[PDB]
Design a protein around this ligand. Structure first.
Ligand SMILES: Nc1ccn([C@@H]2O[C@H](COP(=O)(O)OP(=O)(O)OP(=O)(O)O)[C@@H](O)[C@H]2O)c(=O)n1
Ligand SMILES: [Mg+2]
Length: 327
């Protein structure tokens, strides 16, 4: 299809998303529980809610519980140690006890499979959220992607379109056999928009957690006023870029620098894979996405040679189906 047809199917697919801040009350409900553990402890919001400034249907909320001194140290990295991890699980255990006590109908899951300790909460009516502890990086990288989407608010449509597709096609980490998170696809979307000068480079070091809102304001979204021409033009060029312009053997998707970053300058090579192990397992350096804040973290670490295969196929197949909408 032409950019226009792609644009039109996309605006048409999002028709019921635009119909109907509502997160405040949940923030307050979560703050109740947090305060019964420690009334000096803070609650911060992060994820898509903060990144877009809109709360989507079928998205959880992301919360982190911070101490005063965790905030004031607004630019510290986050310790990747066993005691750090221990500390977070201990506080999260207490808070889970309290959440269960106060809300008997809620499922409160202490998730231990992961690299970052997390409590997953389903109350059963899209009351839906995760809680973490004592980490700045979630709030920090979310303010970074929010900084960019604010330079150019309509780009939130390209990213929302890519996100929904990733989940539909099973590429998204959230689906069985998926390899890239929603977070990784955003880093790809921004990286792309920066390469096309739709966005002005922001150094990740300029983001200060002590200057961020624990609950940031709503950021109005409006329909494309061109019957989605720019959306469809962006989408087609996005796919072209990651298909025929981005050189995955030699390059890294990164917001740490403007221009090109090579795998070679990072030591993200075959030799590194043999030495590697992350979260307990094999890291892959097939599809490279650099984390702006964490040391030596590839967000694309789960992209096996096979999943690199699937990804390209879908990038080819998305050109003709308008991200699975024109079918
Ligand atoms: N490897 C990762 C994955 C996620 N995050 C943090 O956790 C937040 C939530 O991640 P995710 O749920 O994947 O992204 P959302 O944009 O919230 O998308 P959705 O919830 O709609 O799937 C991200 O914004 C990011 O700051 C992170 O620091 N590192
Ligand atoms: Mg989320």
């Amino acid at each position: 299809p032409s950019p226009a047809v792609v644009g039109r199917s996309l605006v048409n697919s999002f028709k019921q998303f635009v119909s109907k801040r509502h997160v405040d009350a949940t923030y307050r409900l979560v703050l109740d529980c947090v305060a019964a553990v420690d009334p000096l402890m803070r609650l911060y919001t992060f994820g898509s809610t903060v990144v877009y400034g809109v709360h989507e249907k079928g998205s959880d909320v992301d919360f982190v519980v911070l101490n005063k001194t965790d905030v004031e140290d607004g630019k510290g990295g986050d310790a990747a140690t066993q005691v750090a991890k221990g500390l977070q699980a201990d506080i999260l255990a207490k808070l889970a006890r309290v959440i269960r006590q106060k809300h008997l109908s809620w499922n409160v899951e202490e998730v231990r499979r992961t690299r970052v300790p997390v409590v997953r909460v389903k109350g059963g009516g899209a009351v839906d959220f995760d809680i973490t502890a004592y980490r700045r990086n979630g709030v920090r990288n979310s303010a970074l992607l929010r900084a960019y989407f604010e330079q150019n608010p309509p780009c939130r449509w390209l990213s929302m379109s890519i996100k929904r597709w990733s989940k539909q096609t099973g590429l998204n980490a959230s689906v069985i056999g998926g390899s890239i998170t929603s977070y990784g696809f955003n880093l790809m979307v921004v990286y792309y928009l920066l390469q096309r000068n739709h966005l002005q480079f922001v150094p990740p070091s300029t983001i200060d957690v002590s200057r961020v809102e624990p609950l940031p304001p709503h950021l109005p979204l409006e329909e494309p006023a061109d019957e989605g021409l720019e959306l469809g033009t962006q989408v087609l060029d996005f796919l072209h870029f990651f298909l025929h312009e981005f050189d995955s053997d030699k390059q890294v998707i990164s917001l740490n620098r403007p221009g090109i970053t090579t795998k070679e300058e990072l030591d993200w090579t075959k030799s590194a894979e043999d030495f590697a192990r992350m979260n307990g397992e094999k890291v892959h350096y097939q599809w490279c996405i650099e984390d702006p804040y964490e040391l030596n973290l590839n967000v694309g670490r789960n992209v096996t040679p096979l999943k690199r295969d699937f990804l390209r196929r879908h990038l080819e197949k998305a050109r003709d189906t308008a991200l699975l909408t024109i079918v």
